[PDB]
Design a binder for this molecule. Structure first.
Ligand code: A8R
Ligand code: A8R
Length: 277
């Protein structure tokens, strides 16, 4: 229908509010990420890691040194890279949670339901925003200061050689939608307010917030993408694809968390690296 009625102005105002929260909560947006991947930005080119020799030069640019070099160099590299991917994941939760609080009505929910929505929703947000940082060659790492190639990640040890491939194959199909930060801001909020998470108390207040986010998203996509019909429908299938692809990812590293013995990082040691930095 698309009318210029007072309810549409509220859906446009909600999109503006979610976008402003998207900028403050997340440092590296897709707008700046694409500027680095194409060299359009005035900043310096990021350090590129494509082989083992380039990775050794990258570690020398880090203040930390890792004073426990295990003999297995195939494990010294794979395990070290994976824990860098996990320490960054923890800081993303701090940013995701900061953005989740900005969604109208989220704080008014039950506190245990807020945990449940973030519990199962953090992974699906990571999969989405990670696509903004990667292309067909590699992924931007360390707040855009680095760039690790895709084929280098495939050259790691056999268990760690394909934990990023399910994310690259999703990105090439998700970036084809060519969404911008304005579209992603609403789309992230829709994933959080998914009212069918296992263990939700009152589903009624959650889906009521999501239905306004869904209406604000379809209005955003129809206005921002004039040459793309059914883009709202295509994006819903990408959301359901995140469901069955995250369950395969969470079950994948549970084998690593158990068979590597040193993967479940010590809780008190985590907080030391966060507060020092
Ligand atoms: C492998 C890898 C990936 C895929 N990424 C991007 C990434 C990951 C996870 C999420 Cl969730 C994510 O999501 C986006 C949307 C976001 O949040 O930007 C984006 C990395 C970022 C930094 C480092 C690293 O190793 N960096 C060095 C500088 C360091 C960091 C920390 C340490 C200590 C453990 C000692 C503290 C030591 C060295 C490695 C990776
Ligand atoms: C020094 C260091 C430490 C202490 N950790 C945590 C860590 C290591 C090893 C084990 Cl085993 C571990 O687990 C338990 C058992 C433990 O020993 O504490 C925990 C790191 C993780 C990743 C990188 C890295 O080199 N990340 C690469 C991807 C990059 C990223 C970004 C850059 C630039 C910023 C220059 C762009 C350069 C290189 C370095 C370190």
């Amino acid at each position: 229908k698309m009318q210029l009625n007072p309810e549409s102005a509220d859906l446009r105002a909600l999109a503006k509010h979610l976008y402003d929260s998207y900028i403050k909560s997340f440092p590296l947006t897709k707008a700046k990420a694409r500027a680095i991947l194409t060299g359009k930005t005035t900043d310096k080119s990021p350090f590129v890691i494509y082989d083992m020799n380039s990775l050794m030069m990258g570690e020398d640019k880090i203040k930390f040194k890792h004073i426990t070099p295990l003999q297995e160099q195939s494990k010294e590299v794979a395990i070290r890279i994976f824990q860098g991917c996990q320490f960054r994941s923890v800081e993303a939760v701090q940013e995701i949670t900061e953005y989740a609080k900005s969604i109208p009505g989220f704080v008014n929910l039950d506190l245990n339901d807020q945990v449940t929505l973030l519990k199962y929703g953090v992974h699906e947000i990571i999969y989405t925003m990670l696509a903004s940082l990667m292309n067909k060659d590699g992924v931007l790492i360390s707040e855009g200061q680095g760039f690790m190639t895709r084929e280098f990640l495939k050259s790691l040890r056999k268990p760690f050689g394909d934990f990023m491939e399910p994310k690259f194959e999703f990105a090439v199909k998700f970036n084809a939608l060519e969404l911008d930060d304005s579209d992603l801001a609403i789309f992230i909020a829709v994933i959080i307010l998914s009212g069918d998470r296992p263990g939700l108390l009152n589903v009624k207040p959650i889906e009521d917030i999501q239905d306004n986010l869904l209406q604000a998203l379809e209005l955003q996509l129809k206005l921002n993408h004039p040459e793309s019909s059914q883009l709202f429908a295509k994006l819903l299938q990408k959301m359901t694809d995140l469901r069955q692809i995250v369950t395969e990812h969470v079950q994948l590293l549970q084998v690593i968390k158990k068979t590597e013995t040193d993967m479940s990082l010590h809780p008190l040691l985590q907080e030391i690296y966060k507060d020092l930095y």
